[PDB]
PDB file of N, CA and C in Angstrom:
ATOM      1  N   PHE J   1      -0.725  -7.351  -4.819  1.00  0.00           N
ATOM      2  CA  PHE J   1      -2.047  -8.526  -4.625  1.00  0.00           C
ATOM      3  C   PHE J   1      -3.137  -7.690  -5.327  1.00  0.00           C
ATOM      4  N   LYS J   2      -4.038  -8.356  -5.976  1.00  0.00           N
ATOM      5  CA  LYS J   2      -5.113  -7.698  -6.763  1.00  0.00           C
ATOM      6  C   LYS J   2      -6.358  -8.808  -6.301  1.00  0.00           C
ATOM      7  N   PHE J   3      -7.642  -8.125  -6.134  1.00  0.00           N
ATOM      8  CA  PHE J   3      -8.670  -8.894  -5.915  1.00  0.00           C
ATOM      9  C   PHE J   3      -9.661  -8.376  -6.583  1.00  0.00           C
ATOM     10  N   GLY J   4     -11.040  -8.901  -6.835  1.00  0.00           N
ATOM     11  CA  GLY J   4     -12.130  -8.421  -7.302  1.00  0.00           C
ATOM     12  C   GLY J   4     -12.359  -6.921  -6.836  1.00  0.00           C
ATOM     13  N   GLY J   5     -12.261  -6.489  -5.527  1.00  0.00           N
ATOM     14  CA  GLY J   5     -12.528  -5.227  -4.984  1.00  0.00           C
ATOM     15  C   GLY J   5     -11.386  -4.491  -4.418  1.00  0.00           C
ATOM     16  N   UNK J   6      -9.891  -4.684  -5.145  1.00  0.00           N
ATOM     17  CA  UNK J   6      -9.112  -3.946  -4.988  1.00  0.00           C
ATOM     18  C   UNK J   6      -7.888  -4.575  -4.491  1.00  0.00           C
ATOM     19  N   UNK J   7      -6.740  -3.729  -3.915  1.00  0.00           N
ATOM     20  CA  UNK J   7      -5.844  -4.464  -3.779  1.00  0.00           C
ATOM     21  C   UNK J   7      -4.684  -3.307  -3.498  1.00  0.00           C
ATOM     22  N   UNK J   8      -3.273  -4.052  -3.836  1.00  0.00           N
ATOM     23  CA  UNK J   8      -2.014  -3.229  -3.858  1.00  0.00           C
ATOM     24  C   UNK J   8      -1.042  -4.102  -3.183  1.00  0.00           C
ATOM     25  N   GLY J   9       0.016  -3.376  -3.260  1.00  0.00           N
ATOM     26  CA  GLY J   9       1.179  -3.880  -2.513  1.00  0.00           C
ATOM     27  C   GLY J   9       1.680  -5.347  -3.030  1.00  0.00           C
ATOM     28  N   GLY J  10       1.199  -5.735  -4.464  1.00  0.00           N
ATOM     29  CA  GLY J  10       1.506  -6.999  -4.940  1.00  0.00           C
ATOM     30  C   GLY J  10       0.540  -8.026  -5.324  1.00  0.00           C
TER      31      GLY J  10
END
């Protein structure tokens, strides 16, 4: 996952 302030793990 990814959003405007980061993420990871898909």
